[model samples]
Structures are given as structure tokens and as C-alpha cells.
Target: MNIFEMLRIDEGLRLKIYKDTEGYYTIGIGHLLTKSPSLNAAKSELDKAIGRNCNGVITKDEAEKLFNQDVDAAVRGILRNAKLKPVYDSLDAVRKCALINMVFQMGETGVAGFTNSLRMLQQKRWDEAAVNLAKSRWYNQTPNRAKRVITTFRTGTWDAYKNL
Candidate 1:
């Protein structure tokens, strides 16, 4: 499956606003509404997109649109990071997805902080990279998702996260 579909399963679907693990007001497959200027900023944007007030609720179609935009933003974020850009280009499709999944969860700067892991990945030391990734706060914060991403990085395949 593609990144979008993978994220759909990893993030799950939430039509109404809710607090994520970090307590951020999120919606629509981990979209951080609070990151938008203000909660009302997101509410207004979705209001316009859905052609209604929304009032803390979004349709599946609207949620999918936001999910696509967020994923694209994550992809671009990874490409724009000077250190990650070249390394990202050197990766295979599955590995690229694994990196994107990381950026999607923790933001580019957060993943960029994984210097050792990035080095291991660049050197194609898959096992070392996976081990290094697991040695992070993110692994503790989101064990299941982190494990799946690390396995994907290690194996260079989607099998790790293919099932729900």
C-alpha cells in the first residue's frame, strides 16, 4: 500500500477533535489543528473546505483531504531538511516511506535529531539503524508505531506495517 493508506491505518480516523498522546488537539489522522495559528484557524479552514461550520466535526472526505495535505507537507519537510535530503534520496521506496512516517509523527527536526540512526541508515546498516531508532523518547511515547517504522527501516519492506 501507499503512504496515505498506511497512515490511515497507523493514525486511524477521527471525525471529531481529540487530544493526541502528546495532548495536542488533533483530528483527521493526526492532523494537529493547534499547529495552525489557533484552533479556530483550523476550524475555519475546515469549515470552508467542508462548506459548513464543522463545529468540531469533519466528514470522511474532508478528513482525507487534510490527511493528503499533511502527508505531502511531511514529505516536503523531509526533502527540505539539508541533512536528510540526500539521505532520503538514497533510500528505496519502503525506506522512504518509513522516513516519511517518522517525519509525519515527530516533524522533520525531531527525526533529524536522530543523527546516529540517520548515519546508520545512510551507511545501509539497517539493523544498527533500527536499534538506534529504538533508543529514543519516541520509541517510548509510541511503541507500536515506532516498532513498525523501525522494522520497515530494518527490512526495507512494508510487511512490518502492512496489517492493521
Candidate 2:
């Protein structure tokens, strides 16, 4: 597989700060952020820490590894949130991927907050889950993503997804 393609498809299409699966303040394409420069911690010392990028950089290999692990962890987290905490193993893959996509975008805690959507999935109510998923703050904030995920939830294919 072309690593670059996977990077753009899975991690992100932009370079910026966001939380990853473990939520340790990620930046770039899903890099694990271990340290943040306390450069701006105090205004008096802020001037002394100029020109520092604060977050660290990661290589292609590093990011690819992180993405793989994050994907695995995301799926596990999604399953745990199910009614029986793994009941969706027998669930349709489309619905399963729908859960993964939501967890991927929102992180496990974020997806867990979708009361109606989560409940629908727990009940194996896939269509209702998709509909509820579309009616969220996340949908309003990322309408394109909402459309893609909703389509995938219904269609069972990643073809509807656009790189985000």
C-alpha cells in the first residue's frame, strides 16, 4: 500500500494540533505527543522560549505506526461502548465502520456523548444511528464528514468518504 495515501486517508489532510486516540495532544498526522514546551507557561519566561514549535515532529514511519495502533484501539473502544461492551462483533461491518469513523473523528469520549446515536447502535438500529449521528454538533461543524459517514453507514463502503 502507498503509505502517503494511507496517511492522507486515515490520519488527516492538514498539519495542526488535535487529540489522538489516547488523547495526549497530538499534532501533524497522528503523532504521539509526549511533551509540550512549557514555553508559554509563564509570561515572564515566554520571551526566553522564542522560535520553538512546542509540539514535536514525527516521521512518516512514526505516524503510520501510530495510525495503525489508533485504528485498533478505536475499534476496541467502540465495541466497549456497545450495550454488552462487544455486542457489535456480529454487527454489520458497515455499522461497525460507522462506529469506528465516529470514534475516529470524535475520540472515544466524544462519541460516547452521542446519547441517541450510541443507543441506536447498541440496539443494532443502524439506520437510526446514522440519522441521529447526522443530527449532532459534529455534523453541523463538519457537514461534509457527516454526509460521508452517514452515506457509509447506509452503504457499507468507504467510497462515500472524502479525505478529511
Candidate 3:
């Protein structure tokens, strides 16, 4: 089961999907009270908040705010008539979703800065990806979180101390 499915959302809100500005659709938790954004609008906002020049290392509060807005926007965008199942079905949900959250916080362009890591993952070269992940600017900037998520992606289980 996808871990994201386990996240508790309030009543009236349904899970929805939408595309990011770069055209990647993602699932998000939401409701009428949740104020989901249209895909293009969400993409524009997210892009403005986290575009090509973002510096690594946002505060937890900042991450939470950006992630919530991005997810809500994605949900509203898809709810408006976009198809999302195929996109959802295409990848490992936990890893991909977690990475999306990270990217949302870190900025897609900034995350893409880890070019070699992404290339390795695309090739299913787990070991190489892990190595590249560790060597990334993100890893260097946020050692604790980066290490835990990379380890989780590599091992499929998380260590409490590492994650915390």
C-alpha cells in the first residue's frame, strides 16, 4: 500500500491529482475547505516559490506551507477534468511522492541539480543513485533528512533515528 494513502485528511476532502507547471501530475489530500488550486495556477505559484534558483534548506514550517499549497493545487487541477491514474500508476508511489514533497520544498530546478542521481534512478541503478544522492548539494545542505530519505529509497525501510 502507498504510505501517502495512510495520511489522514479531514472529512469532505477527497484525494485528487494534478499536473505541476513542468507537467508532472501528483496526488494530494484535500476537501472544499482545503482550497485546492487549479493546476496551472498552482504550478505558477509553486514555480514562483520554488523555481530554478532556490537555495537548498528550507525551514520545516516553510516546507509544510509550500507542500500543502502545491498538493492542494495539484488536487484541484486534476479534479477539474485531468486524468491522473496512469501517471499515478507509473512509478513507485512512496519514493516518488516523497521525492515530490522534497522537490516541492527544495524546488524542482534545485532538485534537478542532482542530475546524476536522477539519471541513475531512471536507469534503475539503485546503488549509483544512492551514491549520487549522498553527493548531492541537498545531502550536503540537509544531511539528516537527505540521508534518511535516500536510505529509505534504497532499503525500503526507515530507521527512526535517521528519519527524526
lDDT of 1 by residue, 123-155 (tens): 999988888889889999899989988898999
Put the candidates in TM-score order, highest first.
1, 2, 3
- In candidate 1, list every pair of residues with a backbone clash: none
lDDT tens digits by residue: candidate 3, 78-152: 334223322223347555654554443354446546666666666667777788788766678667656656765
Cα RMSD for candidates in order: 2.3, 6.9, 12.4
The C-alpha local distance difference test score for the whole of candidate 1 amounts to 0.85
Query: Residue 57 CA error for candidate 1 (Å)?
Result: 0.4
Q: Report the poorest 10 consecutive residues by lDDT, candidate 2.
A: 42-51
Sort order, lDDT high to low: 1, 2, 3
Q: TM-score for all predictions?
A: 0.90, 0.63, 0.47
lDDT at 36, model 3:
47
Tens-place lDDT per residue, model 2, 1-164, is 23234335555732444555444455555543443534233222222222333343344554555567767777778667654245356557555666666676677788667777666666767678788878787888767757766776666666664444
Off by over 4 Å in 2: 1-10, 13-25, 31-55, 82-87, 122-127, 162-164
Worst 10 residues of 1 by lDDT: 33-42
lDDT of 3: 0.47
